[PDB]
Amino acid sequence: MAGLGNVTGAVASGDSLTLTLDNGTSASDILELDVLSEELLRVDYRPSGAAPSPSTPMIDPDASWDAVGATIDTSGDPIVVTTPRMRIEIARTPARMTIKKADGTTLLWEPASGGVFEDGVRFQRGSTDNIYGIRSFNAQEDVGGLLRNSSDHPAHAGQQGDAGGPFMWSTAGYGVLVDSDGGYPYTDTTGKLEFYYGGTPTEGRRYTKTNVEYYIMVGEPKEIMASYAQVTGTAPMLPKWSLGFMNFEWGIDQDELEAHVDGYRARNIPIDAFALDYDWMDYGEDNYGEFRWNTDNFPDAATTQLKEDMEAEGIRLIGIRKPRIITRDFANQRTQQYYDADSNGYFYPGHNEYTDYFIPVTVRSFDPYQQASRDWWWQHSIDAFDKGIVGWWNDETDKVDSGSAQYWFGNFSTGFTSQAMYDGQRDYTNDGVRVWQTARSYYPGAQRYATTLWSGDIGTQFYKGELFNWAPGMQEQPRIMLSSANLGQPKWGMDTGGFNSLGGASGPNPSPELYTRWMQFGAFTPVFRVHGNYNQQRQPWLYGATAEEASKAVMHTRYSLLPYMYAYEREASETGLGLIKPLLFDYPNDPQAADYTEAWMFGDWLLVSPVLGEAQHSKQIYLPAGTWIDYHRGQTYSGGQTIHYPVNADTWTDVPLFVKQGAIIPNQQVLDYVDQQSVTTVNVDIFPSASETSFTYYEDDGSSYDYESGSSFEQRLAAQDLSSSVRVEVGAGSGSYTPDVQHYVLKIHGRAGSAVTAGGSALTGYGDLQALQAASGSGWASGRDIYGDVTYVKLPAASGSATVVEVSGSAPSAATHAIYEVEDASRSGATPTTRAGINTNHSGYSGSGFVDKLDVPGAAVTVYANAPVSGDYPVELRYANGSGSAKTLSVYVNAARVQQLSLADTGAWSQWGTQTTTLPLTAGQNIITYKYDSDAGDTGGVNLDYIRVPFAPTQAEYAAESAKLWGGAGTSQDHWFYKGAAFVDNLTGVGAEASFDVYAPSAGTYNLSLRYANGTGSTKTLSAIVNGGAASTVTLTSPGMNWNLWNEHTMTATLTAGRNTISFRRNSGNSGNVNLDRLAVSASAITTLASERNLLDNGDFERDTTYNSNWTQWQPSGQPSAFGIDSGNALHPPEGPARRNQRAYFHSDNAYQQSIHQVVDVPVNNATYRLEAKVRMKNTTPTTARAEVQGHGGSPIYANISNDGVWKTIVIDNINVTSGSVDVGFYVDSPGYTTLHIDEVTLTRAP
């Protein structure tokens, strides 16, 4: 904010004057003045004499003036330029310009305080001078006058009929024009007349100028304006017809046009032109539709005929143009115009795609408050109902939000809209089809008419403000749900996956992580539904294998709980309480439940707390008074505390779910839909408490209002743990509905009895659950499951009288394995009629059958096996192979391809064998899938009978990132070759620690191995603290100055049966300053874990892309990178990862070469290794697309990638390494538009 310095040189030459100004440095400022006309001066200020920037497009590039012959007198102070019309004085000390008329009248001057500077011009003039220019007003603004005597409005083009620019002039005889892209003119009534470049204005700035180029005009307004047009350009002449009247019109076609022109001509009302709005063009369509004549509206525009016929009637045509292209046709296909624009960079910078609307329609709200209005609404709805609309999604019953229409519906609109459909559908069907509706508001009473509530247009993000701030996301939703419940509307759901994104419908889908977590969440809410914006897709397979499998998994849990759930639907008809409730319902005096929403009750007997955090490794979960049993992991917790709960951030398989002691939970086989088949056996899991608890099992038709007049079935189930037995009462049948249930199978957890009695009779004992199920009439059996000892008791349901069962004694199973019969498991395949099957047509099977039709590509069977801790589980597959030779099948665990199983011929189809494979399981639920994956080279073609999963692993693992961290310990991905989804760093402050919860079957000494990094150069120390006992020192050597190296610290620890705490803390004497990754635990010597075989760093590309990996890339010199890593969720439909959240891609609009490589030193030189990857290719066939192995001692090995669109597995086996290292790579050579996706790359030591 400072003016020019003194003149140190003046060089006149023709009409130019060049001034050098002192700024105190060797690089002086320049000020070039040019006299352009007698009444027009150019001034260019170049700070430090640097070259001027290019002139903006304000300036006419072709402007040209006659020589003026001005008089420039450099002899005196001031320096003096004169013409006949003006006099310019520049004082020397400091340099200051005064502008005058020839006659000496002062027009304006730069003040002492400062004139021109680096960022603008500053003048002073007569304070009563009237100023003009700068700005106009738009069609949304208050409209001022012409005077600009107190102005600070920016100079901009503006919008909606605005005009403006850096042009301030006065009727007092002068004008000032500054070459600028936007900026801030300033005037006030002290006489100031200023212009500042200022900061980037709202409209953007794409022409910046290091210089200040300005023009000073002198004269009357006509002369001022003439000079403005010499500088900025004159207007070319419009066609003469442009002086005529024109009729602009929106909503018009060729017939109407012709009528309109006839009307004008018949009445001798002149007219030269019509302007046509959207009507004229095929806006919305492919092939440059927004440039081509709409021949539906204007048929004769197929040729020049329309032009020529209107010419003959004296009509020229004008056509509307929007400076934008349609990037998606009405069929949701990328347009040709998109491809051309995207490839050549023709989109406006900073403007992304966005969703517009363009066909208007006129609507008006209906009144549901009137009975006669409601009847009419229903009567016109009947035809839609008979043709299959049987649920009513009653949208927008709350508020209209649309231009000038901001109208509110009243508080009873949702109830009355709902009543219309309810009284209506009830009358028409004679109480024979139950009503289902949803609305997006609730007020009391509305529930009488059978409506749910959904949370409206929520955002596709983790929480409010993650991605944008105008809608909440996933994390807020439990608070909405529980608030609805506190209002007596527990029948609630949400748009799982979110509705809104930045840019509207074209905005991103949810990430695979966000989608997976949201499905896990919604499976434990009452109205379980996905939704999204226009042309968005929400099918779980589109989000990659983790999202598919985890979603499937939690959906199986929900559907297995149908009989549990449905009893709550019944309760809502008696008391209004439904399937969910907040903890404060059950714990009204617990201050920790008062505002608790991160967990909630699902029915009476399950507390659920979904993982809602992005990249979350552990949850803090409040458990209120009682005793809780982990649904998936088996351990107990006592209530009245907040627990630390590890979750596997890599698999996304956990849904933290806890059984309340007392629980009586009816459940059933998984159906594809609710009434797919009759269910004749209901399971009832019972976890007895010392006080009686009960559950009233309930059936009815599921369809009609018959239940209202007694047509239903109920039976009261009740349980109690006694001093030395468990008592369970199956009360007598009640009601008139003949239920489908024939037998309950009670699963009484906590005791494996030696006897089960009832009415003076000891029930017949069978050897196992299987043999019990196959028996007719009553029995018992016992076993072990994830929870511990269990007693099974099979009974008739729907007896006319009460049955009281008492399980006594304790005779625990010695079973070491659970058995899952795969014919009870999940059967799938590529199409609905090529799924794997159940069969009994060969002998020797266990259970009720085995699984066949693993002989069409993609056929598979999927078992959900619970594990108490993470680790190595040797899982036995019983199968038959009567094909004459060995057959292959993939084993997938938690959506990762673990192994190709080679299954030997067994002699015949009725002869069975066993293959045992060590599986990397995670604590809680695991997804184990045996699949014919022809794209991985499997053959399929075997039959599977069961699998056997040990109750205990051979060795356990615990992730450091999922441990309780304290004292500054945190998680990080900022170094390479960690296992799992992260590691623990920042063990630097005293008190910093990681505390593992380790389980043991028996008291004893166990081996530990702790995986740690130490790149400090020297040995460092932590303390180990087992069960709060005495600190032992842990001495951790350093491989060197390198944080990408990991070693094992081996040690023993004395442990107790059950839960143990083992901490690694920096105590005051310890030095700290190491990174921890995983603790392995076993009764035997610890070996390589099945989860940790991968020698690559970031082989799954899951690492947050802010952080690097051992991957490197290459392209030819001067080519942009074609390589990135992301989730594919921006695309519609999503092109998702193969597993978890991310995948590498190669893509370019133009021709390209691209590779990525990773080099690793192998653990054992002179041995065999193996490369596996998932790869997907689409669009243009490339010249080369391959996996590559090289640098290993032998010559390059290649495996080609085949253009398809689908995820395939590429494998390079028998990599004989003799160099000590291996380079694995992927390379594409493309002519353009080849997309390659790479995922799940593993380099392992090969059998």
Ligand X SMILES: C[C@H]1O[C@H](O[C@H]2[C@H](O)[C@@H](O)[C@@H](O[C@H]3[C@H](O)[C@@H](O)[C@@H](O)O[C@@H]3CO)O[C@@H]2CO)[C@H](O)[C@@H](O)[C@@H]1N[C@H]1C=C(CO)[C@@H](O)[C@H](O)[C@H]1O
Ligand Y SMILES: OC[C@H]1O[C@H](O[C@H]2[C@H](O)[C@@H](O)[C@@H](O)O[C@@H]2CO)[C@H](O)[C@@H](O)[C@@H]1O
Residue ranges that bind ligand X, judged by CB under 6 A: 140, 250, 277-278, 320, 395-396, 401, 403-404, 440, 456-457, 470, 499-500, 504, 531
CA nearest 797: which of 726, 697, 728, 649? Answer: 697
Among 1000, 1068, 983, 1005, CA closest to 1033 = 1068
Q: Confirm whether residue 260 is marked as ligand binding.
A: no
Q: Which helix (H) or strand (E) holds 80?
A: strand 79-82
- Residue 160 annotated as part of some ligand binding site: no
Q: How far is the CB of 464 from a copy of itself (least distance, A)?
A: 7
Residue 563 as a binder of Ca ion (CB under 5 A): the answer is no
Out of Ni ion, ligand Y, Ca ion, none, which partner does residue 158 contact, by CB within 5 to 8 A per kind? Ni ion
The partner in contact with residue 166, picked from ligand Y, Ni ion, Ca ion, none with C-beta cut-offs of 5 to 8 angstroms by kind, is none
Binders of Ni ion among 153-182, rule CB under 5 A?
158, 162
Q: Where are the extended beta strands (E) located within 191-287?
A: 192-196, 212-218, 246-249, 273-276
The pattern of x and - marking residues 798 through 837 that bind Ca ion according to CB under 5 A reads: -----------------------x----------------
Sign, CA torsion 904/906/907/910 = negative
Q: Is 1168 helix (H, G, I), strand (E, B) or coil?
A: strand
- Report yes or no: 789 and 750 within 8 Å, Cβ to Cβ: yes
CB of 48 to ligand X, least distance (A): 44
C-alpha closest to that of 657 among 744, 739, 560, 585: 560
Task: Name which of 196 and 499 has its Cβ closer to ligand Y.
Answer: 196
Alpha carbon 635 to its chain's center: 33
Report yes or no: 1038 and 1021 within 8 Å, Cβ to Cβ.
Answer: no
Q: Which helix (H) or strand (E) holds 383?
A: helix 371-386
Of the two residues 143 and 1030, which places its CB atom closer to a copy of itself in the complex? 143
Taking alpha carbons only, the member of 40, 55, 68 closest to residue 230 is 40
Q: Specify whether 431 is catalytic.
A: no
Which residues inside 132-161 make contact with ligand Y, applying CB under 6 A?
Answer: 152
Kindly compute the dihedral angle of the four CA atoms of residues 768, 769, 773, 775, in this order, to the nearest 10 degrees. Answer: 20
- Choose one: 151-159, 540-548, 800-808, 927-935; the region binding Ni ion (CB under 5 A): 151-159
**List 188, 253, 398, 935, catalytic entry:** 398
Check binding of 196 to ligand Y (CB under 6 A). Answer: yes
Determine whether the annotation assigns residue 1178 to a binding site.
no
Q: Is 699 annotated as a binding residue?
A: no
Q: Pick from ligand Y, Mg ion, a copy of itself, none: which does 345 bind, CB < 5 to 8 A by kind? A: a copy of itself
DSSP line for 542-572: GG-HHHHHHHHHHHHHHHHTHHHHHHHHHHH
Nearer to ligand Y, 182 or 1225 (CB): 182
DSSP code for 267: T
Is 1092 marked as a binding-site residue? no
Site mask, Mg ion, residues 587-626, x = CB under 5 A?
Answer: ----------------------------------------
Residue 398: active-site member: yes
C-alpha atoms less than 13 angstroms from C-alpha of 821 in its C-beta half-sphere: 16
Q: Mark the segment that binds Ca ion (CB under 5 A) among 759-767, 945-953, 1165-1173, 1217-1225.
A: 945-953
Residue closer to Ni ion by CB (options 442, 645) is 442
* Closest CB to ligand X among residues 497, 563: 497
Name the 3-class secondary structure at 821.
strand
Restricting to residues 259-288, which ones interact with Mg ion according to CB under 5 A? 282
Q: Which stretch binds ligand Y (CB under 6 A): 156-164, 195-203, 828-836, 1119-1127?
A: 195-203
Give the separation between CA 928 and CA 892, rounded to whole angstroms: 6
Based on CB atoms, which residue is closest to a copy of itself, 428 or 468?
A: 468
How far, rounded to the nearest angstrom, does the alpha carbon of residue 707 sit from its chain's CA centroid?
A: 43
Q: Is 1139 one of the annotated binding-site residues?
A: yes
Which residue, 294 or 511, is less far from Ca ion as judged by CB?
511
Which region holds residue 1010: left if phi is over 0, alpha if psi is between -120 and 50, else beta? beta
Query: Looking at beta carbons only, is 140 or 1005 nearer to ligand X?
Result: 140
Q: Residue 979, interface with Ca ion (CB under 5 A)?
A: yes
- Are 982 and 970 in contact by the 8 Å Cβ rule? The answer is no
Distance CA 60, CA 67 (A): 18
Q: Provide the pairing of β-strand 452-454 with 492-493.
A: parallel
Is 123 among the residues that bind ligand Y (CB under 6 A)?
Answer: no
Phi and psi at residue 258, in whole multiples of 5°? -65, -40
Active site residue 457: yes
Kindly state the smallest distance separating residue 471's Cβ from ligand X, in Å: 7
Name the active-site residue from 262, 457, 595, 1161: 457
Catalytic residue among 395, 431, 595, 1161: 395
CB of 1031 to a copy of itself, least distance (A): 42
Q: Is the CB of residue 1112 less than 8 Å from the CB of residue 1160?
A: no
When asked if residue 252 is in the footprint of Mg ion (CB under 5 A), the reply is yes
Q: Are strands 993-1000 and 1032-1036 parallel, antiparallel or unpaired?
A: unpaired
Distance in angstroms (rounded) separating the CA atoms of residues 498 and 481: 15
Rounded least distance, CB 791 to Ca ion, Å:
23
User: What distance in Å separates the CA atoms of residue 179 and residue 121, rounded to the nearest whole number?
Assistant: 11
DSSP 8-state symbol, 342: H
Q: How far is the CB of 206 from ligand Y (least distance, A)?
A: 16
Work out what residue 851 binds among Mg ion, a copy of itself, ligand Y, none; the CB cut-off runs from 5 to 8 Å by kind: none
Q: Which residues bind Ca ion (CB under 5 A)?
A: 821, 845-847, 850, 945-946, 959, 978-980, 983, 1077, 1100, 1137, 1139-1140, 1239
Binding residues: 119, 249, 251, 256, 282, 285, 342, 537, 620, 644, 821, 823, 846, 849, 945, 961, 974-975, 979, 982, 1077, 1100, 1102, 1139, 1142, 1149, 1229, 1239-1240
Binding residues for Mg(2+): 119, 249, 251, 256, 282, 285, 342, 537, 620, 644, 974-975, 1149, 1229
Which residue numbers are catalytic?
Answer: 395, 398, 457
